[PDB]
Curated annotation (Swiss-Prot):
Record's keyword terms, sorted: ADP-ribosylation, Chromatin regulator, Dioxygenase, Iron, Metal-binding, Nucleus, Oxidoreductase, Transcription, Transcription regulation, Ubl conjugation, Zinc
Assigned protein family: Belongs to the JHDM3 histone demethylase family.
Domain JmjC: 136-302
Cofactor or coenzyme needed: Fe(2+)
Organism the protein comes from: Homo sapiens (Human)
Entry PTM: Ubiquitinated via 'Lys-63'-linked ubiquitin chains. Deubiquitinated by USP14 with the help of TRIM14 leading to stabilization.
Cellular component aspect of the GO annotation: blood microparticle; chromatin; nucleoplasm; nucleus; pericentric heterochromatin; site of double-strand break
Its biological purpose: Histone demethylase that specifically demethylates 'Lys-9' of histone H3, thereby playing a central role in histone code. Does not demethylate histone H3 'Lys-4', H3 'Lys-27', H3 'Lys-36' nor H4 'Lys-20'. Demethylates both di- and trimethylated H3 'Lys-9' residue, while it has no activity on monomethylated residues. Demethylation of Lys residue generates formaldehyde and succinate.
One Gene Ontology term from the biological process aspect of the record: cellular response to ionizing radiation
Record-level Gene Ontology MF annotations: chromatin DNA binding; damaged DNA binding; histone demethylase activity; histone H3K9 demethylase activity; histone H3K9me2/H3K9me3 demethylase activity; metal ion binding
Name the record gives this protein: Lysine-specific demethylase 4D
Region of the whole protein represented: 11 to 341 of 523
Binding of 2-oxoglutarate, residues: 126, 192, 200, 235
Cofactor-binding details, from the entry: Binds 1 Fe(2+) ion per subunit.
Amino acid sequence: AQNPNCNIMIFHPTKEEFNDFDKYIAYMESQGAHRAGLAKIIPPKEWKARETYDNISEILIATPLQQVASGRAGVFTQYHKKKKAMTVGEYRHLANSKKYQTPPHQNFEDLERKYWKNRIYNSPIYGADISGSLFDENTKQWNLGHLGTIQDLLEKECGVVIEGVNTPYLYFGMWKTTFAWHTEDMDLYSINYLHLGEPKTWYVVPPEHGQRLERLARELFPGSSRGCGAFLRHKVALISPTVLKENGIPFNRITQEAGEFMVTFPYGYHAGFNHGFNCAEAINFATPRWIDYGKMASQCSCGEARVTFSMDAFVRILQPERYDLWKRGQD
Ligand SMILES: O=C(O)CNC(=O)C(=O)O
Ligand SMILES: [Mg+2]
Ligand code: NI
Ligand SMILES: [Zn+2]
């Protein structure tokens, strides 16, 4: 079996190998990359996402989210308080302010230490889940706005024809902005490209061990667990690497830098934080190997997780028994 220790793999495709997205994902899995739950792909040196970022300040963050934490440094929840709209120019200036900027630090490890020590005492502002793309339309390779759609994958594999669309989202981060422990909707893959700015640190649990993380989370967030059978779908719970190590949860960590892609694999729990002002673009995708994960994916039926138009159809076709009780939560 390839990659039996479930290490995060880093790939360096050639420009020739960067032409066929599906085929390269299949290659990475042939080498065991999915066992980690997360892979890093460094694009060929010849490739560019776009010519420059020189006009990005005019993008609007309609609903910036202030991420307020509750709990202890290693085990906390975050709630998202909606703030007034601001441009990316305004946001970048805010990120660079004395109140919000990255603190002095020696290296990524010292900054990771400062994050876990001090995250809970601050409320950074995240511009998340903004529909859009920063890939140039003339970028033909690994353009996250030109991927094959999940609906088309389901049609190719299963013959069924469903409504829904699949588009990318932009994320504007600052120091301490946080993504809580989660898998993707319907345990899809994701791909994330860090367009510009400061790094993003990721933590991931191998898919084969995801249930271990879930069991820990029910012990650590016991009232949340009683309220919903899939509360990690709410995307509010954080657990530090120290706490994971204390409880024997297998995980890995890696830092993504500007210009790099990350791929999360089906049922690969992940969480992380931003080091400073940055902009990432991400989208869900499917392969044939996903279909079984989609059939088995948990769902939030408490009604908090409140999910997309397109996820309806996935549930309806792959999980017809759930369909009924799941859409009572989403209506
Ligand atoms: O970049 C972020 O804040 C969160 N990204 C993801 O969880 C992802 O790409 O799957
Ligand atoms: Mg602009
Ligand atoms: Ni994700
Ligand atoms: Zn729920």
